[PDB]
RNA sequence: ACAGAG
């Protein structure tokens, strides 16, 4: 039936041999004949649910049912690029005599993750190269190598 | 004839191929030159066709 | 009514040169009441058409059967009774080439009419008395529903 | 210390050289199912008129080599065949021709065509734009011919 | 310091306007387009980035009747905020329920 | 010169897996088994250890010392 | 390298630059993107009027 | 002779000018500034005689 | 020939006119036997992208 | 007084790639300042300079006089040098991924709903098209679903508002035109633009690209002025990557692997060709050869061997192109003429 | 970090600050955050015999189970979540026309792996508030204009 | 004077 194809067209993403068909998102008002696709908060609150299927230290897997691509993608992009953390920016060097170059060492120390909780700190203002208790932390690395 | 841990006290790489000189600090390489074989009869055509 | 043309057709061929496309099929039809052959491109994903089918094809100048030519911009959202409720497949396109037939050298009456539905063509060839009202640069509605 | 930027010349170990053109974030890269986004998107138009099938096999041999920890040889007039690395990719759950179901990172919807992922050994060339940008308003001149 | 700038079209009385969302990208743009297109009073909606160096998006909204295009924009913002509030509540409930069910096992 | 701290593609902290990778190769694993035992699922993380050359272990022979 | 070809018919000019190029389709077909490091060096003498 | 002209492979192909089957083709590659291929075609069923790239 | 890479094991004790190095080089994932013969992967030039 | 201001937005600046073979190797543009370190321009302009972005250096010249500006803007601008002075053919036109992305947009298969049609059309609303009203066209299919065909979305480029006076009219053959259709061909390879609506046929190299006349931008240049041919190329340059980078378009080793239909044909062709060449060898060395007119008996053998060997390439290449599916990537890139040909596909 | 030889010395001082991941990639809290739609591989015709065995090897190792009802092997889909869609069902010629590989559109499977700054259930609850936050800021500028 | 690059 053609109604079967209309229902597959707005609810499934088939995978052919040569290309994935039905890739877009279509349930908008006026796109279909007898269907009403205008915004309805009750239908969204009735169909949405979250199933957490696995969680341990430093990993999480869960399901979201009922949300669309343009919001799950927003959540992925916020988790990649807009959730703040604490990381090293300034490295002040006193007597680096290692073979590792100072720029390369600063770049390596930049990428170490820090266990500070970033809900407690504020942004350092424009300039203000010292920084105070409110908006910075400060580690000290000092290693000297000798013979056994 | 040295071992790789004795290239260390000469500040030299073991994998440096050599074959080059050191003249006033720069490293110069005498390239392989290609010549014609001497003492051989060459039968050739002139510009005039002869 | 703003009907240009109406006859029951009958499918004679589906793919003459093969399956060149995935969603479009170049139908070849022929009527009962007159001798009208009908080249047509339909969308066989949303609306499957088989080999021996028999559908009723109305071409209307307007979609509201009160004869009002009010089409400034088509609103798909609005729900008011139109001509389309009695038909399963409706397209919208423009007549762009009325062309004389070159088969006969004297005393001929067959005229071709080409309607392009944004890329999906339709030749409607037959007697000149049936094609009255087809003008170039005129926008028409194709309407179509299968029969038993 | 120089970081790559718009205008630095990378190569590809098959003569498909090319300058940098754009630097986009991780959140706008297309991502696979496993979470991998590419480092370097390469345009497929370099391949038909240049006929580097060797890069297309280097990618597949590398992808089949890192999934089971081997170095597949690419020796001249020999090397590991396609029929052997097609069996190492199916065994680890990937497609046998390296084409992956890829979700667009801008819209969140899947892409229609499949995209061909793998590790390719790119080498960075000495031609950098910071050593070549040059300008002159009016400056020192020659002594004989008083021209710059 | 101003983040929103409303640029009307040439000959349209306030029902065709291009919103310039400063310091944004595809993140807010696609989600807000999705929630504006749900409104059945909207004929046209879609965004674009001006240039990949500049952090602007130009969101164009064209409505059908005579109502101005500020109202579907504000309705899109409010409905997206409510959707995110509800998703947050359901997610925190499911996290607490999974941690509660794991604490009942293996004891 | 030295093992990078993070993988270039995704961002998993690879840089603490190198001293463990050599130790698992001292226990005579194959590389495809040691990379699985360290927790590297995707191949972008696997090529960080699989293709790395440890040049600083040999550059430190020519460093000046006491 | 004489006078006529090297210094008279063709000669070195100032107010000129030279850089590696790279594509940009978000520009028009009659625009070009000059880097700011070259836009500060190159000057156009604009006369003051009303 | 015409047979001395058409003892080359190609026939029943398509030229962009007159589409005729009786043809006489040519292919070159000996200019590596041209990364695209190089072809030249002769088409003489109706004796039209095109010679293009 | 123009690829950035490493020169040798004495590339830090060496003072040349112009020396280019790469910070984190990687050996090739697909390699010829000639690479094994000339010991290229003891000091490579390039990264696996 | 003279203030020597910096180079600002709108200065007429010359621009040059150094081996200058014709007069379009140096044209004048309008400068815009951007924070990176390279000269940048639209890729439609890559044809006159013969630039290729592989470590390419181009020159710049800022003219220092008002008359040097106005002789550079009126005479030497890009909008006034679209055609070459040699044979009148357009050079500034579309190039690869602007031809491939527009060929796939204007095939008959592609349909858009209202959301994705608005998303593709709204890409061109930047710059001097920021004030214009959009003019979404009426949808083609109405009753079972609502679908815009991709040709209407393409025709937004030729007329993006309701008051734009462009009426473009073009009626020509495509590349894969079969010869017998004339606007009803099976290949859908016959182009009809009528009042800037695309009524049939996909867009090839010979309709959007820099090859020759019957270019739609050349029609807009000759009928509606310079500025309407320049805006449409910017709209195409804006709109075609937005479609092509969200459709996805990729090549693979499976796009050049020979099927089972080819490996049986190629074996038979090699056997027949090598047997006929061996018979010609034996007929030369051990008796009479039918000596072709004008050549010796050794040169007659050369022509017959080149005859038998070049039949193998044709019957091997016409056997692989019959069994390639559509949505093959080199086949798509060769049908739209953007990069490659059929000789390259049949050769690799 | 580094590696030393006797006589060499490293002494420095670091200053950690707050920043978002759009600025620089050392601020990103996650290793990789992504999703996929959930598969629903469905069987169009009942597959029995030894074709049930070759159907279970054109998939992931835990999605197609083979069971016997009368000592006769029938195949059914068991856990379609575990599939990676390697598309090995299209190399086999007889079985291309019995399956419909698909994806449910409105069912996502997120997989967030935190780098260790804070646990990953707290990352998602912070990411939702940011999108709640950006919709708040432009509501405050619709009120400031009018 | 030599090597590069397009
Ligand atoms: Zn990784
Ligand atoms: Zn011809």
G5 labelled ligand-binding: yes
CB atoms under 10 Å from CB of K55, counted, come to 22
Q: Measured between alpha carbons, how far is residue J24 from residues C111, H19, J49 in Å? A: 50, 35, 7
Q: What is the DSSP letter of D115?
A: E
Q: Extract the tokens encoding J261.
A: 């239909």
Cα separation, B47 vs C7, whole angstroms: 87
d(CA I27, CA I39) in angstroms, rounded, equals 11
Task: Show which subunits contact G, needing at least 3 CB pairs below 8 angstroms.
Answer: D, E, J
Neighbours of J162 (CB within 10 A): 10
CA-based angle K126:K132:K135, to the nearest 5?
A: 145
Residue E52 at interface with chain J, using a CB cutoff of 8 Å: no
Distances (CA, A) of F52 to E82, F47, G29, I39: 49, 8, 46, 15
Q: What stretch of H or E contains D61?
A: helix D53-66
- Domain coordinates in residue numbering, chain H: 2-52
Q: What is the DSSP string of A75-115?
A: HHHHHHHTS-EEEEEEEEES---SSS-HHHHHHHHHSS---
CA angle D67, D72, D77 (to 5 degrees): 150
Rounded-to-10 torsion of CA K114, K119, K120, K121:
180
Identity of the residue in F10, F57, F65 whose CB atom sits nearest the CB atom of K31: F10
| CA C72 to C1' L6, whole Å | 56
Helix (H) or strand (E) holding I4: none
Q: How far apart are CA H51 and CA H41, in angstroms?
A: 6
Cα–Cα distances in angstroms (integers) from residue C119 to residues I3, I46, J175, J183, in the given order: 51, 50, 18, 11
What are the structural domain ranges in chain F? 1-66
Cβ neighbours around A122 below 10 Å, total = 12
Query: How does strand D72-73 pair with strand I30-31?
Result: parallel
Asked whether the beta carbons of G32 and J30 are under 8 A apart, the reply is yes
CA/C1' separation B14–L2 (Å): 29
Domain H2-52 has CATH 2.20.25.10: yes
The encoded tokens of residue K8 equal 């060499």
Task: Tell me the C-alpha to C-alpha distance, in Å, between residue E12 and each of E9, J124, K49.
Answer: 6, 19, 69
Asked if residue D14 keeps its beta carbon closer than 7 A to nucleic acid strand L, the reply is no
- Quick check: J248 CB within 7 A of strand L? no
Give the CA K13 to C1' L1 distance in Å: 52
Which ligand number lies closest to the CA of residue F50? 1
In the block, which residue shows the tokens 């390697």? K86
Q: CA separation (Å) from G42 to D130, D133, G34, J62?
A: 18, 13, 10, 7
Q: What is residue C61's DSSP assignment?
A: S
Instruction: Tell me which chain F residues have a C-beta less than 8 angstroms from the C-beta of B5.
Output: 61
Q: How far is the CA of I44 from the C1' of L2 (A)?
A: 28
Give distance CA D129 / C1' L6 (Å): 14
Q: CA–C1' span, D11 to L2, in Å? A: 26
Cα of J334 from ligand 2 centre, angstroms: 20
**For residues F2 and K2, is the Cβ–Cβ distance under 8 A?**
yes
**3-state class of J209 per DSSP?**
strand
Chain-chain contact of E27 with A82 (C-beta, under 8 angstroms): yes
- Core vs surface per residue J297-329: b (16+ CB within 10 A) or e: eeebbeebeebbebbbbbbbbebbeeebeebbb
| Residue numbers in J 11-50, CB below 7 Å of strand L | 18-19
| Resolution in angstrom units | 3.1
C-alpha span between K59 and K77 (Å, rounded): 10
Q: H20: CA distance to ligand 2 center in Å?
A: 7
Written as six digits, the tokens of C35 are 């001798």
Give the separation between CA I20 and CA J157, rounded to whole angstroms. Answer: 48
J130 burial (CB, 10 Å; 0-12 / 13-18 / 19+) is: middle
Query: Which of residues 7 through 36 in chain G touch D, CB cutoff 8 A?
Result: 7, 11-23, 35
Euclidean distance between CA atoms K122 and K139, whole angstroms? 26
Nearest amino-acid residue to L6, taking CA and C1': J56
**Cα E63 from Cα E55, distance rounded (Å):** 26
Cα A66 to chain centroid, rounded? 20
Q: Does I36 touch chain F (CB under 8 A)?
A: no
I18 touches chain B (CB under 8 A): no
Chain K CB contacts of F2 below 8 Å: 2-3
Number of C-beta neighbours around residue D84 at 10 A: 11
Q: What distance in angstroms lies between residue D100's CA and the mean position of ligand 1's atoms?
A: 17
Sort J214 into a burial class: Cβ within 10 Å, 0-12 / 13-18 / 19+. middle
Structure tokens at C111: 């005229």
What is the 8-class DSSP label of residue D81? -
**Preceding-residue numbers of gaps in chain C (C–N over 2.5 Å):** none
How close, in Å, is residue H25 to chain J by CA atoms?
A: 11
| Rounded to 5°, angle at Cα E42 from E40 and E44 | 135
User: Residue F62 carries which DSSP code?
Assistant: S
The answer to whether H43 is annotated as binding is no
CB within 8 Å of D137: residues ≥ 6 apart: G14, G15, G41, G42, G43
Element (H, E) at B33: none
Binding-site positions of J for RNA: 17, 56
* Ramachandran area for residue A121 (φ above 0: left; ψ -120 to 50: alpha; else beta): beta
Nearest to A31 among J113, J325, J327 (CB): J113
The reply to whether J52 Cβ lies less than 7 angstroms from strand L is: yes
Neighbours of B28 (CB within 10 A): 10
**Residue given tokens 């200053």 in the structure block:** K15
Q: Are J114 and A31 inside 8 Å of each other by CB?
A: yes
Helix (H, G, I), strand (E, B) or coil at J275: helix
Q: Specify the long-range contacts of residues C36-40, CB closer than 8 Å, at least 24 apart.
A: C36/C7, C36/C9, C36/C124, C36/C125, C36/C126, C36/C127, C36/C130, C37/C123, C37/C125, C37/C126, C38/C9, C38/C122, C38/C123, C38/C124, C39/C121, C39/C122, C39/C123, C39/J184, C40/C122
Between the two ends of chain J, the Cα-to-Cα distance in Å is 67
- For chain I, give the residues followed by a break (C–N over 2.5 Å): none
What is the longest distance spanned by two Cα atoms in chain E? 72
**Phi–psi pair at K138, nearest 5 degrees:** -85, -15
Touching status, chains I and G (3+ beta-carbon pairs under 8 Å): no
CA distance J109 to J89: 32
Picking from K57, K92, D117, J248, the residue whose alpha carbon sits closest to that of residue A17 is: K92
Which chains touch C (3+ CB pairs under 8 A)? A, E, J
- Nearest residue to A28 via CA among A54, A10, A45: A10
Residue K4 at interface with chain E, using a CB cutoff of 8 Å = no
Strand L closer than 7 A to residue I17 Cβ: no
According to DSSP, the residues that pair with A90 across neighbouring strands are: K15
Nucleotides of L under 7 A from a protein CB: 4-6
* 313-342 of chain J touching strand L, CB 7 A cut-off: none
Distance from the E44 Cα atom to the nearest Cα atom in chain K, whole angstroms: 21
Residue from C83, D114, J211, E56 nearest K85 by CA: D114
């Amino acid at each position: 039936a053609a109604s079967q194809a209309v229902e597959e067209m707005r609810s499934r993403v088939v995978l052919g041999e040569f290309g994935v068909r039905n890739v877009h998102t279509t349930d908008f008002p006026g796109n279909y004949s007898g269907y009403d696709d205008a915004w309805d908060q009750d239908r969204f609150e009735k169909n949405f649910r979250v199933d957490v299927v696995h969680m341990d230290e430093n990993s999480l897997e869960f399901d979201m049912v009922g949300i669309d691509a343009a919001i799950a993608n927003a959540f992925r992009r916020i988790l990649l690029a807009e959730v703040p953390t604490m990381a090293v920016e300034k490295v002040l060097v006193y007597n680096n005599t290692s073979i590792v170059q100072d720029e390369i060492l600063a770049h390596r120390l930049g990428l170490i993750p820090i266990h500070a909780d970033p809900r407690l700190f504020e942004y350092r203002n424009q300039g203000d190269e010292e920084g105070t208790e409110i908006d910075t932390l400060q580690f000290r690395l000092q290693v000297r190598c000798t013979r056994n | 004839g040295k071992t790789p841990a004795e290239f260390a006290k000469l500040n030299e790489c073991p994998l440096d191929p050599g074959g080059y000189f050191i003249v006033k600090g720069v490293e110069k390489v005498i390239l392989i030159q290609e010549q014609l074989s001497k003492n051989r009869i060459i039968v050739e055509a002139d510009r005039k066709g002869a | 009514a703003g009907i240009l043309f109406e006859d029951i057709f009958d499918v004679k061929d589906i793919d003459p040169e093969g399956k060149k496309f995935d969603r479009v099929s170049r139908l070849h039809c022929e009527s009962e009441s007159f001798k009208m052959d009908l080249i047509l491109d339909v969308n066989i994903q949303i609306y499957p058409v088989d080999l021996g089918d028999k559908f009723r094809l109305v071409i209307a100048s307007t979609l509201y059967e009160d004869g009002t030519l009010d089409d400034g911009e088509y609103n798909p959202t609005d729900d008011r009774p139109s001509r389309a409720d009695q038909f399963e497949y409706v397209m919208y396109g423009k007549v762009y080439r009325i062309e004389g037939d070159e088969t006969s050298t004297e005393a001929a009456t067959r005229l071709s009419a080409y309607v392009s539905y944004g890329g999906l063509l339709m030749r409607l060839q037959g007697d000149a008395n049936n094609l009255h009202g087809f003008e170039v640069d005129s926008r028409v509605y194709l309407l179509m529903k299968k029969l038993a | 210390t120089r970081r790559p930027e718009i205008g630095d010349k990378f190569s590809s170990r098959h003569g498909q050289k090319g300058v940098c053109g754009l630097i986009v974030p991780q959140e706008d890269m297309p991502f696979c199912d496993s979470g991998i986004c590419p480092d370097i998107i390469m345009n497929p138009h370099g391949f038909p008129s240049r006929m580097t099938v060797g890069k297309l096999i280097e990618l597949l041999a590398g992808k089949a080599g890192v999934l089971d920890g081997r170095f597949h040889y690419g020796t001249a007039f020999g090397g590991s065949k396609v029929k052997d690395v097609c069996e190492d990719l199916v065994r680890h759950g990937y497609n046998y021709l390296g084409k992956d179901y890829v979700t667009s990172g801008i819209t969140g919807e899947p892409l229609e065509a499949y995209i061909y992922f793998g590790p390719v050994y790119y080498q960075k060339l000495k031609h950098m734009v910071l050593d070549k940008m040059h300008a002159r308003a009016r400056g020192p001149r020659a002594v004989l011919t008083r021209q710059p | 310091k101003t983040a929103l700038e409303m640029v009307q079209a040439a000959g349209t009385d306030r029902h065709c306007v291009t919103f310039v969302l400063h310091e944004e990208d595809h993140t807010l743009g696609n989600s807000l387009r999705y929630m504006i297109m749900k409104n059945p009073e909207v004929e046209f909606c879609g965004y674009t980035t001006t240039h990949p160096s500049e952090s602007k998006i130009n969101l164009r909204i064209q409505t059908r009747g005579t109502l101005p295009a500020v109202e579907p924009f504000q309705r899109g913002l409010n409905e997206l905020m409510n959707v995110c509030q509800h998703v947050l509540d359901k997610f925190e409930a499911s996290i607490k329920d999974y941690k509660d069910q794991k604490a009942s096992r293996n004891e | 010169m030295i093992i990078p701290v993070r993988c270039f593609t995704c961002g998993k902290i690879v840089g603490n897996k190198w001293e463990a990778y050599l130790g698992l190769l001292q226990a005579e694993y194959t590389e495809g088994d040691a990379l699985d035992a360290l927790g590297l699922k995707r191949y972008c993380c696997r090529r960080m250890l699989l293709a790395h050359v440890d040049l600083i272990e040999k550059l430190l022979n020519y460093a000046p010392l006491e | 390298q004489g006078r006529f070809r090297g210094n008279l018919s063709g000669k070195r000019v100032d107010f000129s630059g030279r850089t590696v190029i790279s594509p940009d389709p978000n520009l028009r077909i009659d625009e070009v993107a000059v880097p700011v490091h070259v836009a500060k060096i190159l000057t156009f003498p604009e006369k003051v009027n009303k | 002779g015409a047979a001395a002209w058409e003892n080359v492979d190609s026939t029943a192909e398509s030229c962009p000018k007159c589409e005729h089957p009786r043809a006489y083709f040519m292919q070159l590659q000996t200019r590596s500034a041209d990364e695209p291929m190089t072809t030249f075609y002769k088409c003489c069923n109706a004796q039209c005689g095109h010679r293009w790239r | 020939k123009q690829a950035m890479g490493t020169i040798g094991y004495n590339q830090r004790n060496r003072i040349d006119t112009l020396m280019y190095l790469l910070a984190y080089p990687q050996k090739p994932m697909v390699k010829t036997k000639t690479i094994e013969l000339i010991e290229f992967e003891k000091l490579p030039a390039g990264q696996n992208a | 007084d003279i203030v020597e201001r910096h180079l600002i937005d709108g200065d007429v600046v010359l621009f040059n790639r150094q081996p200058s073979l014709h007069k379009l190797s140096i044209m004048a543009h309008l400068a815009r300042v951007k924070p990176h370190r390279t000269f940048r321009f639209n890729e439609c302009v890559c044809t006159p300079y013969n630039a290729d972005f592989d470590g390419d250096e181009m020159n710049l010249h800022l003219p220092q006089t008002e008359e040097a500006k106005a002789e550079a803007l009126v005479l030497m601008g890009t909008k006034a040098n679209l055609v070459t002075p040699r044979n009148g053919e357009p050079l500034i036109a579309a190039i690869q991924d602007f031809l491939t992305g527009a060929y796939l947009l204007t095939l008959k298969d592609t349909f858009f709903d209202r959301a994705k049609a608005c998303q593709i059309i709204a890409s061109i609303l930047v710059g001097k098209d920021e004030k214009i009203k959009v003019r979404l066209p009426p949808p083609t299919i109405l009753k079972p679903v609502t679908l815009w065909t991709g040709k209407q979305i393409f025709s937004v480029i030729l007329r993006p508002s309701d008051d734009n006076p462009v009426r473009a009219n073009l009626r020509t053959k495509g590349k894969q035109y079969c010869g017998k259709g004339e606007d009803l061909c099976a290949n859908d390879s016959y182009v009809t633009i009528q009042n800037s609506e695309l009524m049939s046929g996909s867009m090839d190299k010979g309709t959007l690209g820099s090859g020759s006349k019957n270019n739609i931008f050349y029609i807009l240049l000759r009928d509606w002025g310079q500025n309407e041919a320049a805006d449409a190329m910017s709209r195409l340059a804006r709109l075609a990557p937005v479609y092509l980078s969200n459709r996805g378009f990729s090549i693979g080793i499976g796009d050049v692997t020979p099927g089972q239909g080819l490996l049986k044909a190629k074996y038979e062709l090699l056997n027949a060709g090598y047997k006929k060449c061996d018979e010609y060898i034996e007929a030369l060395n051990t008796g009479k050869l039918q000596q072709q007119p004008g050549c010796t008996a050794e040169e007659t053998l050369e022509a017959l061997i080149l005859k038998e060997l070049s039949v193998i390439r044709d019957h091997a290449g016409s056997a692989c192109l019959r069994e390639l599916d559509k949505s093959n990537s080199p086949l798509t890139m060769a049908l739209c003429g953007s990069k490659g040909s059929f000789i390259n596909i049949s050769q690799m | 970090i580094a590696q030393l030889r006797p006589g060499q010395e490293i002494d420095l001082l670091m200053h950690c600050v707050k920043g978002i991941g759009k600025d620089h990639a050392k601020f990103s809290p996650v290793a990789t955050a992504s999703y996929r739609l959930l598969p629903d591989i469905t069987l169009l015709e009942p597959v029995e015999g030894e074709a049930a065995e070759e159907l279970s090897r054109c998939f992931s190792p835990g999605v197609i189970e083979v069971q016997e009802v009368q000592g006769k092997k029938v195949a059914r889909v068991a856990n379609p979540r575990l599939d990676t869609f390697s598309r090995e069902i299209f190399r086999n010629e007889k079985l291309k026309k019995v399956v419909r590989l698909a994806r449910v559109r409105d069912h996502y499977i997120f997989s967030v792996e935190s780098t260790g700054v804070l646990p990953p259930d707290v990352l998602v609850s912070e990411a939702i508030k940011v999108l709640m936050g950006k919709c708040r800021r432009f509501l405050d500028e619709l009120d400031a204009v009018q």
